[PDB]
Amino acid sequence: DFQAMGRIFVGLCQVGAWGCFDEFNRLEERMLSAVSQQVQCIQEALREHSNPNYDKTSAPITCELLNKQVKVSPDMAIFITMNPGYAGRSNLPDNLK
Amino acid sequence: LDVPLVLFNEVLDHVLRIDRIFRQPQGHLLLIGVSGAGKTTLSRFVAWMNGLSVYQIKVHRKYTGEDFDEDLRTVLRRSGCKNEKIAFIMDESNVLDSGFLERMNTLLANGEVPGLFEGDEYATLMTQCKEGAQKEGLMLDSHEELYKWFTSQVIRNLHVVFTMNPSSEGLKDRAATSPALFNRCVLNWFGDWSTEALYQVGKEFTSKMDLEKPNYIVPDYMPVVYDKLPQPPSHREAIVNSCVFVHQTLHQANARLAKRGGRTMAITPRHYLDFINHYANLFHEKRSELE
Amino acid sequence: NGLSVYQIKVHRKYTGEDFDEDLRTVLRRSGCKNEKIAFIMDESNVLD
Amino acid sequence: MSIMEQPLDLTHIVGTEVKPNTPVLMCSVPGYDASGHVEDLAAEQNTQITSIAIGSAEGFNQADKAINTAVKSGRWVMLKNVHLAPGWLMQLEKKLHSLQPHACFRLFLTMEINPKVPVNLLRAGRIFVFEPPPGVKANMLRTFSSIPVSRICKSPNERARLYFLLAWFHAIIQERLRYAPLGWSKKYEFGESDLRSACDTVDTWLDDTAKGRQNISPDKIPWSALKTLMAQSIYGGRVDNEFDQRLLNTFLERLFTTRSFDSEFKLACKVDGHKDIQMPDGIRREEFVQWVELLPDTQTPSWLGLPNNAERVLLTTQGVDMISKMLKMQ
Amino acid sequence: FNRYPLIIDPSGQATEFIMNEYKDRKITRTSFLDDAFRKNLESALRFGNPLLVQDVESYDPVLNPVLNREVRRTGGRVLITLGDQDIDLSPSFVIFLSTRDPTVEFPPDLCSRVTFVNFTVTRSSLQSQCLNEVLKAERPDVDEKRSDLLKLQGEFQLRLRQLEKSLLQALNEVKGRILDDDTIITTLENLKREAAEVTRKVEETDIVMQEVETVSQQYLPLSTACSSIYFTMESLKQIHFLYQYSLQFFLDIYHNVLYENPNLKGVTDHTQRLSIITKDLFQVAFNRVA
Amino acid sequence: NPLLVQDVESYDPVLNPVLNREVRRTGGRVLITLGDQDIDLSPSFVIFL
Amino acid sequence: RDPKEWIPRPPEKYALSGHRSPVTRVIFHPVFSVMVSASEDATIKVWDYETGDFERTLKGHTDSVQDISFDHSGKLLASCSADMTIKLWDFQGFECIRTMHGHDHNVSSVAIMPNGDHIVSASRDKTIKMWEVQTGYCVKTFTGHREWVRMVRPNQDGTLIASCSNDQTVRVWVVATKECKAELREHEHVVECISWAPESSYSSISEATGSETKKSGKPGPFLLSGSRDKTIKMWDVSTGMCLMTLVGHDNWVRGVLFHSGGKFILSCADDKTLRVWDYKNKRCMKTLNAHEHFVTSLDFHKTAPYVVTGSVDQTVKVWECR
Amino acid sequence: KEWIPRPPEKYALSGHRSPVTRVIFHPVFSVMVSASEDATIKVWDYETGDFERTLKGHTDSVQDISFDHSGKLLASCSADMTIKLWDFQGFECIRTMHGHDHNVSSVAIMPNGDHIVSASRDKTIKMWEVQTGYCVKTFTGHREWVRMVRPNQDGTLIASCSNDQTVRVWVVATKECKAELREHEHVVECISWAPESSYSSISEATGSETKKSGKPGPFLLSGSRDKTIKMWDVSTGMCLMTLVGHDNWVRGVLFHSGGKFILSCADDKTLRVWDYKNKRCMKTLNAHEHFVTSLDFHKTAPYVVTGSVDQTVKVWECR
Numbered sequence A: 001d002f003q004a005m006g007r008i009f010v011g012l013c014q015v016g017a018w019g020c021f022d023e024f025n026r027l028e029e030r031m032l033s034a035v036s037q038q039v040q041c042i043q044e045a046l047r048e049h050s051n052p053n054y055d056k057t058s059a060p061i062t063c064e065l066l067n068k069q070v071k072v073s074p075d076m077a078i079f080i081t082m083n084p085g086y087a088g089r090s091n092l093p094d095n096l097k
Numbered sequence B: 001l002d003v004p005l006v007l008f009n010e011v012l013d014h015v016l017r018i019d020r021i022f023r024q025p026q027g028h029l030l031l032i033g034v035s036g037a038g039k040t041t042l043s044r045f046v047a048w049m050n051g052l053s054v055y056q057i058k059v060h061r062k063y064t065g066e067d068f069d070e071d072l073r074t075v076l077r078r079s080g081c082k083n084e085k086i087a088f089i090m091d092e093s094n095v096l097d098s099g100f101l102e103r104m105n106t107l108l109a110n111g112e113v114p115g116l117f118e119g120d121e122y123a124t125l126m127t128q129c130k131e132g133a134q135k136e137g138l139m140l141d142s143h144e145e146l147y148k149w150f151t152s153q154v155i156r157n158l159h160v161v162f163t164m165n166p167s168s169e170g171l172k173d174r175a176a177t178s179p180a181l182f183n184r185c186v187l188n189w190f191g192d193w194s195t196e197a198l199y200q201v202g203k204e205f206t207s208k209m210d211l212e213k214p215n216y217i218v219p220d221y222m223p224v225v226y227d228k229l230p231q232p233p234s235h236r237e238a239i240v241n242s243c244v245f246v247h248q249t250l251h252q253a254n255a256r257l258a259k260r261g262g263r264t265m266a267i268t269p270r271h272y273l274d275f276i277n278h279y280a281n282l283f284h285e286k287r288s289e290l291e
Numbered sequence C: 001n002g003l004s005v006y007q008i009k010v011h012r013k014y015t016g017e018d019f020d021e022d023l024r025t026v027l028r029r030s031g032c033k034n035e036k037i038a039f040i041m042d043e044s045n046v047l048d
Numbered sequence D: 001m002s003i004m005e006q007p008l009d010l011t012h013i014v015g016t017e018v019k020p021n022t023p024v025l026m027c028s029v030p031g032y033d034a035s036g037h038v039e040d041l042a043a044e045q046n047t048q049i050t051s052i053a054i055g056s057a058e059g060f061n062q063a064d065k066a067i068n069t070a071v072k073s074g075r076w077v078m079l080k081n082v083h084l085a086p087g088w089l090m091q092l093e094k095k096l097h098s099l100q101p102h103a104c105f106r107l108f109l110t111m112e113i114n115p116k117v118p119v120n121l122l123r124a125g126r127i128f129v130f131e132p133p134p135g136v137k138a139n140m141l142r143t144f145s146s147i148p149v150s151r152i153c154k155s156p157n158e159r160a161r162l163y164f165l166l167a168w169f170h171a172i173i174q175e176r177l178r179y180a181p182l183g184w185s186k187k188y189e190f191g192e193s194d195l196r197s198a199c200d201t202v203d204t205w206l207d208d209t210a211k212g213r214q215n216i217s218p219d220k221i222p223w224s225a226l227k228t229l230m231a232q233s234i235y236g237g238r239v240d241n242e243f244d245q246r247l248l249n250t251f252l253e254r255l256f257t258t259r260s261f262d263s264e265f266k267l268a269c270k271v272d273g274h275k276d277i278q279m280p281d282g283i284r285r286e287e288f289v290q291w292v293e294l295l296p297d298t299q300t301p302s303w304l305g306l307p308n309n310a311e312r313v314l315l316t317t318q319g320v321d322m323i324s325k326m327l328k329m330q
Numbered sequence E: 001f002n003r004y005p006l007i008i009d010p011s012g013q014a015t016e017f018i019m020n021e022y023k024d025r026k027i028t029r030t031s032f033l034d035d036a037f038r039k040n041l042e043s044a045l046r047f048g049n050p051l052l053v054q055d056v057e058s059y060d061p062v063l064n065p066v067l068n069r070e071v072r073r074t075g076g077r078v079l080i081t082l083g084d085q086d087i088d089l090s091p092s093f094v095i096f097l098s099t100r101d102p103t104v105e106f107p108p109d110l111c112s113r114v115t116f117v118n119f120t121v122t123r124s125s126l127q128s129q130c131l132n133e134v135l136k137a138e139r140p141d142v143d144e145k146r147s148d149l150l151k152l153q154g155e156f157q158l159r160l161r162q163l164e165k166s167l168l169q170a171l172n173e174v175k176g177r178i179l180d181d182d183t184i185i186t187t188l189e190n191l192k193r194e195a196a197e198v199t200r201k202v203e204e205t206d207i208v209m210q211e212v213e214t215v216s217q218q219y220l221p222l223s224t225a226c227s228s229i230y231f232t233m234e235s236l237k238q239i240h241f242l243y244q245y246s247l248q249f250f251l252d253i254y255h256n257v258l259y260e261n262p263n264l265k266g267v268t269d270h271t272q273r274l275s276i277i278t279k280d281l282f283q284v285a286f287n288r289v290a
Numbered sequence F: 001n002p003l004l005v006q007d008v009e010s011y012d013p014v015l016n017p018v019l020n021r022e023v024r025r026t027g028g029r030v031l032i033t034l035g036d037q038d039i040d041l042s043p044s045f046v047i048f049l
Numbered sequence G: 001r002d003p004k005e006w007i008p009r010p011p012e013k014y015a016l017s018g019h020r021s022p023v024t025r026v027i028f029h030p031v032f033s034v035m036v037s038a039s040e041d042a043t044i045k046v047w048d049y050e051t052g053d054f055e056r057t058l059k060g061h062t063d064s065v066q067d068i069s070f071d072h073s074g075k076l077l078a079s080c081s082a083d084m085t086i087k088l089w090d091f092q093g094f095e096c097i098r099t100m101h102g103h104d105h106n107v108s109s110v111a112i113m114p115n116g117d118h119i120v121s122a123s124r125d126k127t128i129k130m131w132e133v134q135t136g137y138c139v140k141t142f143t144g145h146r147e148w149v150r151m152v153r154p155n156q157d158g159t160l161i162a163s164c165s166n167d168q169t170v171r172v173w174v175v176a177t178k179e180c181k182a183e184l185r186e187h188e189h190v191v192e193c194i195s196w197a198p199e200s201s202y203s204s205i206s207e208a209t210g211s212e213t214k215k216s217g218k219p220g221p222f223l224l225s226g227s228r229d230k231t232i233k234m235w236d237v238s239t240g241m242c243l244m245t246l247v248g249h250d251n252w253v254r255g256v257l258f259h260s261g262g263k264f265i266l267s268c269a270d271d272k273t274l275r276v277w278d279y280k281n282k283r284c285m286k287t288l289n290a291h292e293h294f295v296t297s298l299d300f301h302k303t304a305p306y307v308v309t310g311s312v313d314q315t316v317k318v319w320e321c322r
Numbered sequence H: 001k002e003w004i005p006r007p008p009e010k011y012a013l014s015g016h017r018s019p020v021t022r023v024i025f026h027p028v029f030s031v032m033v034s035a036s037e038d039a040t041i042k043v044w045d046y047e048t049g050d051f052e053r054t055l056k057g058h059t060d061s062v063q064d065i066s067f068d069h070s071g072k073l074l075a076s077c078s079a080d081m082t083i084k085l086w087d088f089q090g091f092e093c094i095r096t097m098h099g100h101d102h103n104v105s106s107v108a109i110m111p112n113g114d115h116i117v118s119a120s121r122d123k124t125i126k127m128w129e130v131q132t133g134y135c136v137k138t139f140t141g142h143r144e145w146v147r148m149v150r151p152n153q154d155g156t157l158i159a160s161c162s163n164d165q166t167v168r169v170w171v172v173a174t175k176e177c178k179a180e181l182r183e184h185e186h187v188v189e190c191i192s193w194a195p196e197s198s199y200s201s202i203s204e205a206t207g208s209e210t211k212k213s214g215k216p217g218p219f220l221l222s223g224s225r226d227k228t229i230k231m232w233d234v235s236t237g238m239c240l241m242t243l244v245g246h247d248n249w250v251r252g253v254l255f256h257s258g259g260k261f262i263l264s265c266a267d268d269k270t271l272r273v274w275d276y277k278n279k280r281c282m283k284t285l286n287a288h289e290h291f292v293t294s295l296d297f298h299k300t301a302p303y304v305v306t307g308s309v310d311q312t313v314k315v316w317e318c319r
């Protein structure tokens, strides 16, 4: 659900580890829509981490996850592995895709 | 209940049938017919005739399975422990969940729900059952024979009536979701009020109103609606025939509206009752004003 | 004084079992729930 | 009906024709989202917007709080993929009916076209349908309107030509989808995201090659880099058929070469049997946009490289289909 | 009504019509969505206060005894069993049910228990509304003239009815013969002279109605086209479920084409303005709907 | 509903709240606590023994 | 006048007296320089505390008015009365825009959430209810109190509500999920009044009780409760512990609150006195013979140095602070 | 303040079945009390014009009513020869002092709040104790019907006007008429003294010279049925200036709370506010369709009330 996925994202971002989420379409479609928000937040945090004007001496990059400010390590990434050929699997919303 | 009723042949037949069912052990009723046909009122009247206590669950928006379980527990305690004759009137609209149907299935068939009581409330049930066994003159100590006595008392005392509208697909689905409903219940098909019933209701209700026209000419081609209408109809008989025709006209109008694809609202006997009441009031008012 | 006033509601069918049940209620409230209770009773309430 | 081949002007409609009490229902066919459009609208109007994705109970809580704040502060609220909560949609409509918001308040409800969306909500708000642009000219217009003017007009003067070529390729590819067995092998999701990735790739490689110089040689443009990246990652990523990949490679090699900078370059060949599409000679954004707006109204699948008869039966169906709608609402 | 009315008004005009009718009786508006609906219902039942309840699609079954009038009379008191408690049902109590969804379905029992009152938009009513709107927008003086004269005719007809009734009452209350008491003759003469004055006032208001309608005839085709366009909009829902348009949508289109028209900045000819308004009505309707 | 009760020599000590009139105003006007139930006293009530 | 240290002084500024019945509660307008006081005669009289002149009476309640409260903007006034109704007053035009029923018995408290979109009320039927400001619908019903609930007061951020009751306890509830976060019971009698702790006081409280600094940085919301055992207990909501007990009142504590600067505790009691407590040393600094009868409520202005106190003697008094 | 009544009314209270004789204001509450000729004293909420209650103890027509400083007691007089004292907390008569033969016209509680003055047709003014009810001292010297009586601001000096054309000021301790004034053209009906805040405003209004003590001295005013309103000095007894312009018989006079204008009612169906220091304001405002009987000015609120023979009490805003 939203809470478990958010907690996993918090762990991945704090560690700085890659998240390979296999069978991502097995989630409920509403839960996919909700998770899209956290994925977008992580991606925008990484994007503004990547800009040249950022300096490591300044405040560390943080993101809003589950109503907390969590530092996002540059090394983390989110990977979803899916098989769209199975009937009954949820369809990812466009804002997530 | 201070609500007037119009008596005709079908009402007498139906109250006789309900009285027959209410006098048998483990006698349950499955009334099927259009809403507003008097099923609930007739059931309450017959229960009052036979000394049964009418119980209805007060369903609302926040009603859930636990409330239904509590109501069932109260009814079973009153029926078995207190040895009270109770008529459990329940409607299809009261069924908000399949758990409701499961509980009703078990209660109708076995006469008891195996695990409706646990813990402290099971102890309370056992104490009440012990008190009832003492009251009747029976000597029961252990829990199993007390529960057997409670089940026997519930079987002998509790009567359950389900009233529901005649939906064919709904009927087929209920034939499998609640099998006991078609085995442990006596199915009465009230249906809609017949043409004869409408004619009798109109005649009896408008008997007070004048509707007398000695110089009334019977048309050569009388648009007969009630089959048993006397061949030389009077003015009053013609008026009642016209009222029945109006009701059937509404039925055909809804039929054609649904056929074209529009949205329809079901016509009930209460529509006919409102129609005749309006006719009486308007007739009286217009006559008074004109005079 | 913050005391909860408790009076037994006797009637013609009030027996010793009812009195014991009322005593159990008062003791449960005053010993387990830490509720201060003033148990007011009249001589007329003593039917036995 | 001319107004409707133009790109949708959300700015004017939201500013003027939409009351604050009326939600902007934004229904899209599958493969399209409208979140980007209104996010850009809020960005260019300097209006704060709170975006919430529906799907969680705390999502509903955050929604209700955001609407409660914005109806007084006058900010904007987005709720995306609201078609997954029809009952909550009914409750939201009931809440919206009895409400007196700030004059600047706006609520956007992004959904796909779904039969489960409550009718009363649809009657409550104003509906906008987002779908593939009707024609190649319309698709070019939408692409050029979406991309900011300053983004195209950068230091290299060839960037505008590359952007026009990319827009034409996107339009051709996306319009080939209307003809499912012929244009491709299946309904691929060639959408705005692929276009944005392609634009970013073009910008990155052009900046890498042209070190801020005002002009660059047409042969010095990294044609191979762009061709391979589109064929493998950007537009070839969704391709799972060998022959679809071959067709994509054919289009990329026909378009993305130095010959595209020739004055006599032919975008299409013999569209009507005699005339063919001629590549614009302009070097700036405005010239390409004017050329796009000057395109003929008549469009045929020969613009896409498909045979001219490929649109016959489909059109016939729609024709008959049109009659069926007229004969159903008499 | 015999059964308590259930009103279906998407526009809501019936709602404040009901409020205005029962304002003097202190009618209370509530909803099934309110958790305190039981308290308001029992207060209205006890004190006989008119009640209006919205959002009937969330109907609370607790109203079943009230709608079925399952009252029990004992000791001169009419007891109604609301849930598990008895309430003395005041004879002045009345309840109205309202909803804004014309397409909502209802269970057959609720349909049996209530008298449905549907407020649909008819072609004639919409034509009249559009004609009044265009008259106000283009010829405000004619619009206010028509409003004032409708007020005047209402007052005059009420006065005529009152005078006729008073004349009959006077001729019916005489204790003897007319000429025995002169005050009767005074009253009859006064009533007759007032009737003559109101009749001449009615005649002059009628001729000014004649001129008002003969200047209003010019805009009738626009109103007919407006009604036709709106009903085509309503019929649009037959071809796709997404094509749901309300009356407020068409009225906003009409307001935009009337007042917010960029093509009426410098045009003053009434015929030219009417033609521009019609053309831009068609254009704006197509643009907004499509 | 004025009430007459016979056989007072079998007095039921349930009328003690009614006879002593230890009622409380507000929150429903006149409130009596009959046994465990918060009854609303009707001012027209009167009892005769 | 140290801008965070003034305390009231025995010389009163004005003794406003227009009420015909005991004054129940007195509140300050958050924005305007005006003050409001409800009484038991079903009246809500509005006074200007700078010049001490009556302005206007708000009426419409049938029975005694028990609580009045403002929103953040000061544009709406929520009031509750003994007639089982809660009225919302448009403070600009001074008309009751909405009346709310639903409480089964006397409504003894009312408060508007900080967001300004909800109204929380507590009534004698042992229930707390939440009402929408816009629609006036009851949306949530906090149950769990075993007796008459006397006051309800939300915190600064509006995520928690505290309720005192005749059941000897103070219950802290989470508004979002309706659960009972905490149940604080140390008073030996009925709890009358409660109050939350302003942010500017947390650190002070943290060093007043000797509580070590938490690694989170938030000391935890602190609550106060005056009760009829003549004691005022201050609690840590996070841990549920009574940080301290303040003793010295001679009778039931009717109102309690912090100094706006969070350095002192202002309280009033039926001993006819208003007391200023130095909770640094857990001892009462100052005592004022505020009124000639019971003191029912007090309010302390956020910025201006004024203290307004109501009383059963039908007199509302303004105190300059020096 | 510059509080001035305005032609538009707020409420025209009509509950009395008989002409209204006097209206007063409660000292602290938002309550106005009106006595009428039907032996009933009605109590109203002037802010919203809502009938509150009625007190029907008196036998004959009630003439004059008066509060105390605290507003907890209400002294009333009537033609039934008796003086009633009303407890204003529960609104029931608590002490009905008798005597003082024939119709009693006026009654007043001097600010000390322990004694009452009363005047009547029997040509004398009696003093009563609130606590006990015993007439302790009787003031004689008026040879005719004493109409209206008022004490000072500290319970030491009393003024009595009568049909005998003489206004007599009496001292509590010495029981002697220190000042007797016989100068009016026709019968004096209404009197009212000056508050503190007005004495200074008199000094430049008349040019009077301060004595050795420097205090201007206590002041009187008397309106007389000869359509003249004359303002007088307690210490000397000499005329300062006269107000003329009332069409008909004057019935009620009092000073503005700010001590700057003069507000008076008269049988001229109109209410007149007049300036005295520079004679600038001469505003005449029609108030009732019939004879206007009495009026009152609120101490702080911007409200005035008028009771008339038309059985109607009217409220005017002040602006």
Ligand SMILES: Nc1ncnc2c1ncn2[C@@H]1O[C@H](COP(=O)(O)OP(=O)(O)O)[C@@H](O)[C@H]1O
Binding pocket: B003, B004, B005, B006, B007, B011, B034, B035, B036, B037, B038, B039, B040, B041, B042, B163, B270, B273, E068, E069
């Ligand atoms: N025979 C009858 N004569 C008059 N009224 C009737 C009759 N039967 C039913 N009704 C009306 O129907 C109402 C009760 O309907 P009910 O029995 O609840 O419907 P259902 O049969 O669907 O349960 C009553 O208020 C009564 O007025």
